[PDB]
Amino acid sequence: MNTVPFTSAPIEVTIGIDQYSFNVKENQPFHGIKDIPIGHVHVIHFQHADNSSMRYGYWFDCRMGNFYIQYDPKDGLYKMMEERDGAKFENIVHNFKERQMMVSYPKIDEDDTWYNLTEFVQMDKIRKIVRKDENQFSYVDSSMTTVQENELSDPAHSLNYTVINFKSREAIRPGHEMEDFLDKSYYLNTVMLQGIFKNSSNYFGELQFAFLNAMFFGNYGSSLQWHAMIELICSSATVPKHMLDKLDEILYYQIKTLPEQYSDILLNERVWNICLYSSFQKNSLHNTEKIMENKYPELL
């Protein structure tokens, strides 16, 4: 179990760690988060009490270094940093734990939610979507745009998701216009899976990472990417059976975890109704259809 110490909490903020969150009052004696499960990526995220505008945060993996949070009063945000002095870090964490100034990552033992949301998410792929090679952790926020969004303005601050566009020459083979537009199997299996992602684990990883950014930060371009990657699969007549089974489980946990109160802004009515009731895979997502119908029958 690893630890992300905080130098201090000078400004009132709601802090999230994975799907958990808690309120820290301005100048409250908060010095970080302990007992963080090793083996998974994690996200620590922030929303200031005084400006709910701008949810931001850091993707990190405690196996890749010792990380801490420190408020910057010039730039006005909680920043993640790496401590290279290993002895100083263990010493710091020991003192804060001894004085019980840290909240415990509150994982119930029955609870595989976070594993199921991040099953295919790897730090190394996150850092290829969020480019800032000088840090081992990756910053994301509400307002960052995607490479495809910038094609329709600061490139260093973009989310480099895989561009999916159903009316593109990449998607459509000359002479198979109708075939490839109505059955996207070629684009899924040959262009994307064999060509770009190499395997379905990498595809699912980007899909899961897009959902989580959309959900945690209200990142609109991530939400578009998550739906696009679902729709590409559901609109393909020929999909490996194992991918469909896994997709059903992935979406099931994503739908289970979504705040009921933001379903209206995180779920695209058209894509979901198409995927569950019209597409080639309309009969292949039993768990997802059942939770969708029982939790958001309005959307349908």
Q: Which parts of this chain interact with other proteins (CB under 8 A)? A: 167-169, 172, 177-178, 181
| Closest of 70, 74, 2 to residue 30, by C-alpha | 70
Nearest residue (CB) to other proteins, 83 versus 183:
183
From residue 132, how far is each of 46, 110, 300 by CA, in Å? 20, 36, 40
If the CB atoms of residues 169 and 241 are measured against other proteins, the closer one turns out to be 169
Distance, in Å, from the CA atom of 123 to the CA atom of 127, rounded to the nearest integer, reads 6
CB 41 within 8 A of CB 121: yes
For other proteins, the closer CB: 112 or 177: 177
Least distance from other proteins to the Cβ atom of residue 181, Å: 5
| Closest separation in Å from C-beta 165 to other proteins | 10
258 neighbors 267 (Cβ within 8 angstroms): yes
Residue 108 or 178 with smaller CB distance to other proteins:
178
State the nearest-atom distance from the C-beta of 174 to other proteins, in Å.
8
Which tokens sit at 28? 């409250």
Minimal distance in Å, beta carbon 172 to other proteins?
6
As measured in angstroms, the least distance from the Cβ of 228 to other proteins is 17
Considering Cα of 47, then 108, then 41, then 195, what sign does the dihedral take?
A: negative
Closest to other proteins by CB, 167 or 241: 167
Minimum distance from residue 176 beta carbon to other proteins (Å): 10
90 vs 177, beta carbon nearer other proteins: 177
**Helix (H) or strand (E) segment spanning residue 60:** strand 56-60
**Element containing residue 2 per DSSP (H, E):** strand 2-5
| Gap between the Cα atoms of 129 and 160, Å rounded | 4
- The DSSP output letter for 105 is P
